[model samples]
Target chain A: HIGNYRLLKTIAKVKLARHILTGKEVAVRIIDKTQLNSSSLQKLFREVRIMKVLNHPNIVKLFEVIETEKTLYLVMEYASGGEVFDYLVAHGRMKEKEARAKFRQIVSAVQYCHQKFIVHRDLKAENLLLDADMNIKIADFGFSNEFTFGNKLDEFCGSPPYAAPELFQGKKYDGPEVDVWSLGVILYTLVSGSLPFDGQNLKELRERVLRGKYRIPFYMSTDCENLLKKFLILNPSKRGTLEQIMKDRWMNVGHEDDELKPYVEPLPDYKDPRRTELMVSMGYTREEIQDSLVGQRYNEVMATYLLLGY
Target chain B: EQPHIGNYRLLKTIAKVKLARHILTGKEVAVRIIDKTQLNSSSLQKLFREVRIMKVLNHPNIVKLFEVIETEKTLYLVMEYASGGEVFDYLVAHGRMKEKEARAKFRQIVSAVQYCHQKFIVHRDLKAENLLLDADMNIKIADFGFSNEFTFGNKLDEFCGSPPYAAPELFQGKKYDGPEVDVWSLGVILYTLVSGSLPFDGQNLKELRERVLRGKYRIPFYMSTDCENLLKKFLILNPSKRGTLEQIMKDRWMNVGHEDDELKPYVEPLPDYKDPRRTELMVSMGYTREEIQDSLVGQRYNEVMATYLLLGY
Candidate 1:
């Protein structure tokens, strides 16, 4: 939590703000402008500034943007749904069926980001925020960046544990491939209750990463191991992107009509179903998005990153 | 103005890195002088000589290599520098052009490459990046970088080039015809210029190999017959029997090339003889000509270039 804001205690940054007596609590993310690396600050700002213009419910809302010379304030609505990580943390492992269901939703969101030319540069388990109910809200901006070529990224700023091999070598990295590697790490941790790749030091970890050495015990499901292979391809140029992986055994296993767990708690931030001084201050209105399809605003938010750029 | 080679005190450079200005006929002339090192013995007598030869190939569509600067340790090719940006970027930034625009661009490239071929010089390194444009969008195949000029009757033995565009036979570890290889590259460029994506893409090694094995890539079903036919004719997998340059220049896509009427009007004295730092920035993020030029060329040099130039054939 930042600045006395009781933000959700996930990873290092996001805040779940609680306002007493007024009977309203929202996710207020105070940008960790201080902790961000100086060299990366300009690139990070460019990306978030583009993101601040993006308004999507499935995407984290930029309800209030306080852009000062140094500080960036993002007042967000708290998604009360627990996150995909919560399922993994609580159950010690996710059921294959349930994992795939949640994977589809996350992939759908990420796929949307890709189509709009935005890459989630720092996608990982911890960055995936779950609100009070369970809907996913992707958070964090310190590592996000944009490139004009291929609309891809190569700056190595994310945690080394989930970083791709291309990033490890400081070579030309494809953004989606980085996402695929991290997503694979997230998936493995979610299913196996541990990291597929682990070492005492970064050197060892990188060595393992290059060799793509991972332990998927015989006890693990055959399908799970197969899915892991698709994501963890050490040669980033070889790694299947989200688009490619969507066609993998994992996504293809389920039908289009497979049941989703009914979302608990009101999806208040969506469709502008609720109104308050905060929503007005945030500058998004129901009438503005009323004609658009669900997630259309979110799609616009990602498109903004593509245009002025990610 | 004594004839020199690669290294000389680079002075008053003109037309360093420039944009494609719509207005032409000398109003757009710009130049700069950059750090020129002293050319060493080997460089002055051999390398600078090579730069001089390349500089003399003055053609309208090909960047006119005016002279060479020779010093003890360094050499420079004083010529028309292409700063109008890359053809690949031009196509991507703007989608498919009007049919007329495509035809205009393709004809110039074929004309330039054919001129090189006729001179018994094959631009072993012919890709969108190496080909540039000036004001009025006239194409200039610059530098003849990579291998120096080879005379007529040289054996087409050496192999070099970009991976995706390299002819299939060249990739198979056998010495093959150089001109036939260029035919495949023409197809790749045409396809990429029209379609924002590559003709074939693979996530890994296997996919790249598979794509080359398969040939005659089709465009979107909506593509014009003229465009499709242009790519098909040049993209023949077998290089030994690829159509002659004469055949390509005659295609309907070129709008009937008129040798006299083809040159786009532009100012001619050339920029001052200097490699302006700012213009170089537009070309490279870090290279001051020394670092990046070698890597960019050497990376695909052997594959793109045929080694026929090393001998007096």
Candidate 2:
């Protein structure tokens, strides 16, 4: 409802090391008050205040304030950096082997957040921030709960789009498992620019998300393709746990985009029977696009893009 | 109800990056998805709030909000796209509307406003600009971003709407009865139609806000007595004393005094809500009213799409 001028000053992220101030350029957040039935604004207020205590360069800082109007305003440091989703759309879906390498870095940072025990309940494109270098910085912490490691969260609060099945069913969901569900959604969106399980019924959507039923598009490779489904499993215990995903064969397909070097893909051995400079030009450098002649199946017609290898 | 088939793959991107898609039954549809690229928690919340209000309302004069569809990166609104131009544009293309012609158009808006009151819906935005003229020439109130469903007597707390016709109390940070403000905007609109110029104007926002707050408009010299009288009733500064919808509809000018002979004839035919294809579309969209055993039988909703959207052709 901040359609009116709220007169809040926005500080540049370049100078946002510490302190809270207000005048009029700040982009104020408006709360959607319809659902979750606010039963106790104060109880939830307290929970939000707890989230404000968090601090990190990669994270947006949520500040606490109690006003005389019995009003509570949580002031979160704005991400002057643009959204990471914008960066992904620009890069297009990272080629199968390449996407895994990036997600590996992203989840590594996410792993750090989990190790610190911060459960970012709403982990969608909007909340994920990107600084100048296109590096990732997890943004909004509204639905997040930071508990001491090993403690589980029970509240059902994440956005329905990226929400895990357990949270939607009102089951006392495990915090770690919910984060895993979001990671699967995040992985899908990072590559496809959309969700894997977008259904009409809320319950059906939840079931599909938990079941990890995703159709890998024609673009991705077999390994990175299957890994997406593995990342999103109905059973949290069987869900692609972070440990397994980081070491998955597709994940280590060697691609990194450091400015100092071109995207370094794992160059396969030249002497290998499968290697062929003649069969590598259809958008993959030797290792990525397997030599169709060497790996051809009797019934499988080679892809037009991969046929001539030019 | 746009079928929730997530497998409906991306058909293609159109101009402005909007998506043209294959929907349920594999029928192609166009969509302008709400981009969440710059949204934060607060922004996201505000967007969801707007969607909720749209779902709650079901009025003919309003554009219908169907349902909120979500994908991982974006959220979309299954909305009834207005297939017509705006009321302002209609008024501009033709000068002052003929008495009978104006009556039909104005009657639709009046009916819409009355329905809104019955449903406890206040169209905070009520300029001719906001009044969208449907293909059939019916005016539908389109945006509800600032519309709040008030529990009567709980005064509206915030003030955020168009400037020129905003209630005076709004400038003082006091609560406003949205309907009252709407009446004032109507006065300005009617005056413009007759006079072809704004009664009040300023160089900037501050001057405009203050002039609007002051109720500073005056009747032009050529205005007839009937016109002046209607203005006096509706344009009252106090919302409580402002003309009620009943009085506005029955006003002597609109009813008895207006020169009907000078106005254009009402030419449009009645709408085709009974067309089989249209009805089927409505049924598929969950707008079809079902036969039921009793009041209790029809109480529950089948699809999440709002009832009003179903009525939209």
Candidate 3:
């Protein structure tokens, strides 16, 4: 039991826990430190660092981190609505109107990340989570990395079904292109009730993706089909960028200019006098709490303060 | 002299064009009243075809056909009134549109054309004069005199529409599927929108046809690369090579105005995961993977799992 939090159940590697002090439910990702090699450990912290700085309504929030000799615990915002993949599996496919609404949120979230110099290399249906309110919360930043324009990454990431042609060709790619390709696959899946490119194995999938061979459903609007074609271009250089995706007519349909504006809420001030007083009331000395807050330590003091509310 | 047809009060006639008002809605509408005595059998057949085609088309960018009225001697076709008049007149008065404005108008035209093609209808006479602008300055594609319902892969032999906007295939007297010809006319319209002049013009039809068949036109020096590329693609002499309505709709230049900065490559060294200040943290929180697993069910996540399942072990 971590301090004032109690684990209620496990959802894969993550445990659903309740903050006893505030009664707020949270997701705790328990990583076995021993299982990670040096390179894997590096990737873990890279993901942690990326997630820590990202603050978007559509992105899953990383509440705090707790470390022990044998394990690392990543506390995050609990999304009760679950994976979009499961939703798609159950519903078969979404109507164009519903798909457009969900796709707009995805594009908005991705554009925000791109603006902040981060590229989510593993963008697919499964990574997209829906909260109880049905709003999208982009989860998992492990394959995401910081990139500047023109920088190419060689590492081939993401599922074979969603991977870009350049990735399968063993060619380096400017990060956002792969994400754009995956978004195309996701959009196609959301509307068509199936993968755009599929095969019995990776070899066939690679061949299909590389050849840019996939049939667009006849029912899809021409605007949507056009956008999908742009996104699924064989050349990374020609693939639609996040900005282009957001500007697309299909993406803008039924949306107001202000609807695409990013929700910006400044990071919570950890040293608010009210918060400190509350911590003090909980029997923590002012000096030690102040030290932890000032040092930006993700300890019990910080966790309790965050759990109190942000 | 018919002053009213059905619930419409005909105000005046501009030749065959008459302005009318809907009695219930107080909305202005345009009525094209054709005299049965003046039309030949073929022209009368064409009129019916236009009505049949327009009745089935429903798009914001395409003009609406409110109703058809027949009075034995005359046939009145009531359509959505475009108060702002023809886009041709708009260009004549305003001169060349800014690339931004042209893109907006062109996108609407492409959208309407795409809608038509999806339903197997092709607007054979897509031109500036046929494009009307509503009060809000949005394009309303009008004039379906040459429009027809086409079967896929079937070649149409009849040559129609203006010389300057005609595709090379039309000029060569070669048979063509209807949609490609419309795409070619769209290219001319796009060029006219940005340049404020027809791409191919001459003293007579022969010279205009020569210019069109040659597929030669100078792109404005100030035209954007994307716009120019689309023009080049659209103006190709071969019908198959011309940019389709789908391609035109998705062209980069057609989607301008929402420009943004491209993300720059990270110049800093990769994060050192081993940094004590960054990686190491101490807390009382505890939970074993097995302990958590024993309590519950299944799950997921993206990037992390993608790497863990595919990239890593």
Candidate 4:
């Protein structure tokens, strides 16, 4: 046994191990020293190098690292509930309240990371995981690096879908700004269960994001729409500060902004079988039609609102 | 100093499995700790390397790796506990599997194996003892210690995996394609499921090797033509002649009649996020999450209801 742990099964490049005494399990990433090409070794240690200094509830914990005869073992806290992407796959889109709750946790975690002078360059739904209680726990720090004292992160490494527009400009950017842009995309995904700006190809997708060409669908609460707009500005400098975001009315609901209410006039309800009939003629699936109906909530004005947006 | 970590209290120690509980979350996890010092350096390396790959896999049919606790001297693998025990237990308890039940379990196995292959992984040590069942009786492929990465068509030379489940090429000590070897193992698993006995039951290792080479397993008189035909194709002596997994998947016996079921008439969207415009339009068109849930409430998605009720003409 490594420590007070029991070696169980081998997964990809890690070990699923258990603490024999406490029964608290962890994922032991076992990297063979022999397999280390210099670049891969750098990449592996870079993850450990950043993770070693990190201590955040929102961050995946690096319990400890052990040196073996021929391998390097990094013990990490296990996320039992899996990734936010997995949840999105099963649920399609989350309820507004649920989305807000998760997003608040995400913002808090990222905000803490920024304070720690570290930046998670690759932030996406897959990187955002949930613990047993479904609380957000950020994972996969292979792309993470330290940033402090105005040191701009120049690394052109991130998933294209979540990459900040400035990265595509062939220049360095403030790490926090890059992170914020990804957070904007994540928030959009959590609420809509789809990307705000997806292209048929990476080139088209990059163009869309760089041009700030995504539309904020009208169904979102004004608060959500307003914050998304602020976060997804084409200019990184113009983006909302993490501090400013923490105080959003939506985030502060029940905790601080008890008096705040969503500002929207209830539109007149319409009795129109003809509109749903219009969609049916369009040959949408029954579920799709039901989704439209459920979303419209029988408000004829709402149906018209949906129709016009499409 | 003697060592241990976390709040896991020891439940019991069997020959292999040590039952344990997480006092913090009240979660029970299976703990497997391997003694590395007993192993040679190369053996230990392979063990560490294989376990590392197995840790990342997560699927409903595959057992989950909750954590991999490591110490300077030992490696501990923490996994989800399969309370119902091994597939071997089921086969022993009930002599032969009904083809219907076997098909369901086998389908889950195929999906899991398919997922692993897509990841370029091969579970080299697939056997009845490795296939476990959860409380709900869902099959969970529990072991991957002998598994290795195999690019499609790469010939593997190791004589790994159990003797009975071993492919003929492995017996000959010949270099063989790795994926087809797993396919051969799948065939053995299928035969054992129906016959309630290993297809290649050599009275000894020598006898077993010969039987495997000859591919002389018998189909019981009571066995259906479907099982016999499927079994014949899988247990081919020549690895080149063995049926591909995709081909086996298409067999009538392998596929149950679920595909023939009719689509449900009314399907409700989950009560989560709806496109605002879509919701507004639905509301504009006199429907709501509430109204739609009501319209389709308690109804299954596969019904043949009138299209007009949902279509709203």
Predicted structure with the largest lDDT when compared to the true one:
3
Q: Is the docking of candidate 2 incorrect, acceptable, medium or high quality?
A: incorrect
Over B1-313, each residue of candidate 1 has an lDDT whose tens digit, in order, gives: 2321222222232312212111211212221222234334543355445554564454678765433333444333334545575675566567655666666787778777776677666665466655677767778775463232211111111111234565665434344347766777788777766665567543222233456657746477766787888787888877766887767766666554455554332223552323344325424433345333443344312201111111101
lDDT of 3 by residue, A231-265 (tens): 88888887766775676788777875644554355
- lDDT at position A152, candidate 3: 18
Tens digits of per-residue lDDT for model 1, A1-310: 3332345455224555643323345555455566556655676557556665444435665544455666665555555765555556557766777667667667766666666666666566655767655566775432221121122111122244576776445354456666777888877766665666653223344566677778776667887898888888878778776666676665667675553331233343433333323333455354444432244443322222222211
- Would you list the rank order by TM-score, best first? 3, 4, 1, 2
Candidate 1 local Cα displacement, residue B70, angstroms: 3.8
Please list the residue runs of candidate 3 whose C-alpha ends up more than 4 Å from where it truly belongs after superposition. Answer: A143-158, A259-295, A308-310, B1-313
DockQ of 2: 0.01
For model 3, the local distance difference test gives 0.67
Top-TM-score candidate index: 3
Candidate 4 TM-score, C-alpha based: 0.40
Candidate 1 regions exceeding 4 Å error are A1-310, B1-46, B71-76, B81-83, B145-162, B204-206, B256-313
The deviation in Å at residue B297 for candidate 2 is 8.4
Q: Indicate the docking level reached by candidate 1.
A: incorrect
lDDT of each: 0.52, 0.50, 0.67, 0.62
Q: lDDT-based ranking, best first?
A: 3, 4, 1, 2
lDDT of 2 by residue, A1-310 (tens): 2222243443311112222112212233333333223443544555565454443445554432323243333334445566655556566555565555456655665555665566655566655776555455675444332211111111111244465665433344546666777777778776675557653222234455556566677776677666666667766667755655666666665533322111222332223433244334424455443453234311111222221221
Model 3: which docking level applies?
A: incorrect
Error of 2 at B234 (Å): 1.7
